């Protein structure tokens, strides 16, 4: 089925900038916001995760660096928890790989409402972002 | 005292736990290794990196793989590569390229020296060429001389000494390589040259080998007194015998016995103290 996922105007500009790190190198970063029941995913703020040579794998996530940055974001006015993360798949369509399934499954015990977003900055040059 | 011995005792236990993870990773590697892979040509071996080229003429870059070492790797080498990830999972299987067209896999023939008679005059001369250096070469270095790199084999317009050529590959019980001269000329340019070029490449793997050439009159000429084109319809293969025998090959146990029909028509450049020493009628 379908639902409505709201994304703030500031979050779209940051995801397109994060995907500019490189075309062959896939990028991944966290997000912030709230939810309304199960039918609404609100994307307010996004986080930029550091790069990893494993190509966005389950072992490429650092919880130590995550806990240190989210504690500093509380002083900046962010009261919202992590709503998910975005993963760029440049050059291809919108689909999930075998690595993304095992990676997203590891976060099911942490936050079951997490969202895995697939953004394609290469095909977004037409004026409408394919995501 | 017991504390120092307890840490070393638990060290072997922690190594066994991590060893099970290594054994599980090896099982994943064996599961990731399935017979249908492809073979590519190694281009170049800052960091550690290896460049290869597939047989389809596709150049793919790959990082250094733990399955291979820079000592074993070397440019211009055929190793197995992955079809999807294009990673080398297999090293060189102890063979440079291949036997190409044909190769002689026979071990020993049924012909010996007991089937001939009255030939002892010329038999002792053939023993001093391709036979004794297979054994007494250690004694040859003490005298300061060098083993002959070949001997011209000819005779009257007839059968010839080929009956004794089998006895040389029999009583000595060494490696024999049969190379036919008329089989070295083909319509494809360069394929006939790779036959002799790869003949000495595999001759370096097995040292006690003897290369035999039948009917040397098949390939040779100075190629003149004609009209324009038609050159190198012969000498393309002859240049292999010129460069290889005078090149890195023909060291100690690498020898070539060239049998032919008549000495009237041949290339005088083929006879040299660096290739064919003994010329025996």
């Amino acid at each position: 089925t379908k639902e409505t996922v709201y994304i703030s105007s500031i979050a779209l500009l940051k995801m397109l900038k994060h995907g500019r790190a490189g075309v062959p190198m896939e990028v991944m970063g966290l997000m912030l916001g709230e939810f309304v029941d199960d039918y609404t995913v609100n994307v307010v703020d996004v986080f930029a995760m550091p790069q990893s040579g494993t190509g966005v794998s389950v072992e490429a996530v650092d919880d130590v660096f995550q806990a240190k940055m989210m504690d500093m974001l509380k002083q900046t006015g962010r009261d919202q928890m992590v709503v998910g993360w975005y993963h760029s798949h440049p050059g291809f369509g919108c689909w999930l790989s075998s690595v993304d399934v095992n990676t997203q499954k590891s976060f099911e015990q942490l936050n079951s409402r997490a969202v895995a977003v697939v953004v394609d900055p290469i095909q977004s040059v037409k004026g409408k972002v394919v995501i | 005292i017991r504390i120092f011995r307890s840490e070393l005792q638990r060290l072997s236990h922690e190594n066994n736990v991590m060893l099970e993870k290594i054994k599980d990773n090896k099982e994943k590697i064996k599961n990731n290794r399935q017979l249908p892979y492809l073979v590519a040509n190694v281009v170049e071996v800052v960091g550690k990196a290896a460049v290869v080229k597939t047989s389809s003429r596709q150049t793919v870059f790959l990082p250094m793989v733990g399955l291979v070492d820079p000592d074993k790797l070397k440019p211009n080498d055929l190793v197995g590569v992955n079809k999807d990830s294009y990673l080398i999972l297999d090293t060189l299987p102890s063979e440079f390229d291949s036997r190409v067209k044909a190769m002689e896999v026979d071990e020993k023939p049924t012909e010996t020296y007991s089937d001939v008679g009255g030939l002892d005059k010329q038999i002792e001369e053939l023993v001093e060429a391709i036979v004794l250096p297979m054994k007494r070469a250690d004694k040859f270095k003490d005298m300061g001389i060098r083993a002959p790199k070949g001997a011209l084999m000819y005779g009257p317009p007839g059968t010839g000494k080929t009956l004794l050529a089998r006895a040389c590959a029999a009583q000595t019980n060494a490696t024999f390589l049969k190379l036919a001269a008329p089989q070295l000329v083909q319509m494809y340019i360069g394929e006939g040259a790779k036959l002799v070029r790869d003949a000495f490449a595999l001759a370096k793997e097995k040292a006690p080998t003897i290369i035999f050439i039948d009917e040397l009159d098949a390939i040779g000429t100075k190629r003149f007194d004609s009209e324009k084109s038609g050159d190198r319809e012969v000498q393309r293969t002859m240049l292999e015998l010129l460069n290889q025998l005078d090149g890195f090959s023909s060291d100690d146990r690498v020898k070539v016995l060239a049998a032919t029909n008549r000495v009237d028509v041949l290339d005088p450049a083929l006879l040299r103290s660096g290739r064919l020493d003994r010329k025996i009628e």
Binding site: L13, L16, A48, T76, G77, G127 | -
Partner: protein
């Protein structure tokens, strides 16, 4: 003279922090800019925020977080290694007399002349009210430079 270019990513980042930090009663939100000032055209490709609290009747009381300066080094440097601190920005329409003392705190981290960026959050002006100033030796004066909009695939899309 030199040139200053502010990307719309930095613009919307500074303008959104007004309601995010609950800024009211004519206050300011002090941020930070990230760009390359080595060339003749200053281009800011990244920006963040810093907590700022100042009394209305007391101009000698202001709060600034210097620990967050070291926190972005563990993040941005692992993504874009060319990002450095060229200065900071303010969300107030007009600068105050406290900006002279702010330059003393960031002069150690910045490797060049800090850039003073002013972004109007009221949007009551025409065109591009966002202005930039460069603090040099006069005692000290602020040299104004024209502000443009960054044109790149990471923004116009």
């Amino acid at each position: 003279h030199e040139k200053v270019t502010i990307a719309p990513l930095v613009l919307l980042s500074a303008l959104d922090h007004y309601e995010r930090t609950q800024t009211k009663e004519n206050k300011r939100c002090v941020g930070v800019i990230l760009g390359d000032a080595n060339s003749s055209t200053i281009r800011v490709t990244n920006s963040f925020a810093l907590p700022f609290e100042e009394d209305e009747k007391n101009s000698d009381v202001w709060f600034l977080d210097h620990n967050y300066i070291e926190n972005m080094n563990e993040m941005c440097k692992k993504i874009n290694a060319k990002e450095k601190l060229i200065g900071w920005y303010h969300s107030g329409p007009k600068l105050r007399a406290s900006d002279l003392k702010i330059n003393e705190l960031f002069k150690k981290y910045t490797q060049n002349n800090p850039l003073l960026l002013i972004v109007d959050v009221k949007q009551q002006g025409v065109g591009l009210p966002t202005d930039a100033y460069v603090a040099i030796e006069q005692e000290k004066t602020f040299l104004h430079l024209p502000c443009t909009i960054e044109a790149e695939e990471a923004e116009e899309i």
